[PDB]
Amino acid sequence: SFEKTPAIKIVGNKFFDSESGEQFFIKGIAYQLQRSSYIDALADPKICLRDIPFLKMLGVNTLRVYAIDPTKSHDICMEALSAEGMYVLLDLSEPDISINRENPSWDVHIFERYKSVIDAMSSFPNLLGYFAGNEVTNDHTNTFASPFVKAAIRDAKEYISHSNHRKIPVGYSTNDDAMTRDNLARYFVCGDVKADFYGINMYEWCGYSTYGTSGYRERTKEFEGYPIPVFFSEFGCNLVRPRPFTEVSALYGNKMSSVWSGGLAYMYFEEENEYGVVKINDNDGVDILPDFKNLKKEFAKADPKGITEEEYLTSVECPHIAVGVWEANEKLPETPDRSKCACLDEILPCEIVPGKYEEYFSYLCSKVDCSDILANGKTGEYGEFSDCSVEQKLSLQLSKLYCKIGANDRHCPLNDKNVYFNLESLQPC
Ligand SMILES: OC[C@H]1O[C@@H](O[C@@H]2[C@@H](O)[C@H](O[C@@H]3[C@@H](O)[C@H](n4cc(COCc5cccs5)nn4)O[C@H](CO)[C@H]3O)O[C@H](CO)[C@H]2O)[C@H](O)[C@@H](O)[C@@H]1O
Numbered sequence: 403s404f405e406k407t408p409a410i411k412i413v414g415n416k417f418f419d420s421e422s423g424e425q426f427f428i429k430g431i432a433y434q435l436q437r438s439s440y441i442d443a444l445a446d447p448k449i450c451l452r453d454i455p456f457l458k459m460l461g462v463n464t465l466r467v468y469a470i471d472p473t474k475s476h477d478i479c480m481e482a483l484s485a486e487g488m489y490v491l492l493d494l495s496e497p498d499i500s501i502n503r504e505n506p507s508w509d510v511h512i513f514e515r516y517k518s519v520i521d522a523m524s525s526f527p528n529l530l531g532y533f534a535g536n537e538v539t540n541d542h543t544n545t546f547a548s549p550f551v552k553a554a555i556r557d558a559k560e561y562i563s564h565s566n567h568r569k570i571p572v573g574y575s576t577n578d579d580a581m582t583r584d585n586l587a588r589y590f591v592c593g594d595v596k597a598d599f600y601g602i603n604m605y606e607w608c609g610y611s612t613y614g615t616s617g618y619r620e621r622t623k624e625f626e627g628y629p630i631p632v633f634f635s636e637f638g639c640n641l642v643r644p645r646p647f648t649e650v651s652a653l654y655g656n657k658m659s660s661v662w663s664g665g666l667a668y669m670y671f672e673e674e675n676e677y678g679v680v681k682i683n684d685n686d687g688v689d690i691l692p693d694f695k696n697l698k699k700e701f702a703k704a705d706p707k708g709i710t711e712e713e714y715l716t717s718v719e720c721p722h723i724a725v726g727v728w729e730a731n732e733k734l735p736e737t738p739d740r741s742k743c744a745c746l747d748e749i750l751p752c753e754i755v756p757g758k759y760e761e762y763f764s765y766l767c768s769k770v771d772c773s774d775i776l777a778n779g780k781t782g783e784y785g786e787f788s789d790c791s792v793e794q795k796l797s798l799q800l801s802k803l804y805c806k807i808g809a810n811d812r813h814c815p816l817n818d819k820n821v822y823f824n825l826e827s828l829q830p831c
């Protein structure tokens with residue numbers, strides 16, 4: 403039963419409860435355990451059922467989860483959250499399978515990860531939304547990563563659209579770099595592809611600050627009339643401790659509640675970073691920390707004045723390119739084609755099984771033309787096989803070199819144990 407969590411839907415720039423028609427405001431906390439690769443607390447009933455009672459005491463209605471294991475079951479924890487009126491915002495990526503801001507790609511490997519998460523989690527009515535990226539572009543030196551994230555948003559939305567699932571919204575979580583924030587916000591709603599919602603990881607309010615002095619007033623004026631729901635995907639500057647969380651009073655007050663859809667505190671678990679509200683002891687029990695009571699008290703006082711769906715019902719230009727400032731082309735990479743790329747596994751004479759990549763690409767791309775695997779988010783030029791996996795891309799170039807030599811003797815021209823001649827290439831997509 404998910405009776406206590408009706409699906410949330412988006413209308414204009416606001417969230418609404420699909421049954422009652424009341425505006426939904428996020429009162430959230432980040433919930434993600436790390437090791438001393440990722441840990442999936444929502445796949446382990448003994449963990450999630452320990453913490454839900456404490457999450458209930460805090461008075462949250464939403465969790466942000468950064469990584470799940472899509473091969474494991476999540477119905478016990480998701481149903482337990484639903485029984486306390488709690489929703490989940492979920493990142494599709496994980497640390498080892500993400501759009502790399504230093505060398506961005508949108509490819510079959512990352513897209514399959516996103517699809518796997520979507521197929522694991524879309525059956526739950528309390529899945530609020532998916533993030534297609536988190537702080538990919540984070541300063542003026544890597545703005546060319548953003549077209550790859552926009553392609554990911556497009557393709558995740560289309561995959562969801564063509565599935566039998568509820569049309570769960572797909573958005574983006576960004577940082578708060580002064581030089582890039584306005585351009586990033588405009589970019590993710592420009593042209594033909596738009597984020598469904600926009601989260602900012604917001605740490606401007608430290609200690610006993612105010613609406614005016616924190617920067618919250620200027621941020622609120624910047625985002626007034628923004629066409630999609632906007633919220634703080636993280637908050638909780640820890641400069642002054644114990645964190646009073648007085649930003650919460652501002653966030654759900656009358657000035658900010660007309661613009662923002664709430665926010666999520668960072669975070670539940672203490673992990674030697676002074677950001678937790680509880681610490682898990684050596685006996686796996688929950689020790690409440692000094693921040694807990696302040697967040698609890700602040701969420702309890704928060705009473706956002708929203709508007710109902712009925713009374714509410716009653717193309718934007720992409721930022722121009724400027725060298726060293728904004729370098730994200732409007733033109734996006736194509737949808738990764740799993741079948742086309744899988745055909746390379748069948749037909750290529752020379753293959754490589756998954757430091758080595760940099761050396762091998764450097765070597766092979768001085769002997770053959772690697773344009774067909776290059777992807778340039780600045781110029782909007784995306785090679786024909788730039789959507790394939792890194793090993794497929796490498797295999798293509800090795801095979802091109804093999805055919806260029808033309809010895810035709812099954813000896814692939816690269817000395818490495820991972821290289822092998824593909825016997826399927828001989829069998830006459
Ligand atoms: O796509 C951009 C990058 O993604 C990276 O993986 C990503 C990973 O780094 C990120 O880590 C999160 C991490 O960034 C986040 N976190 C939050 C904070 C608080 O920051 C306080 C501040 C300090 C200074 C100013 S504000 N610090 N870390 O905590 C989360 C839960 O513990 C973590 O999941 O979680 C993502 C989702 O799963 C992965 O997509 C990849 O590893 C990179 O290669 C890639 O470039």
Ligand SMILES: OC[C@H]1O[C@@H](O[C@@H]2[C@@H](O)[C@H](O[C@@H]3[C@@H](O)[C@H](O)O[C@H](CO)[C@H]3O)O[C@H](CO)[C@H]2O)[C@H](O)[C@@H](O)[C@@H]1O
Nearest residue numbers: 540577578579580603605606607608615616617639641
């Ligand atoms: O500079 C790049 C860096 O920006 C970070 O966001 C900053 C905020 O950290 C900063 O926050 C506070 C001040 O606005 C406020 O007046 O005082 C407190 C200290 O008492 C500051 O911490 O404000 C600036 C400007 O609005 C923000 O850009 C991002 O979080 C980070 O991702 C980025 O790397």
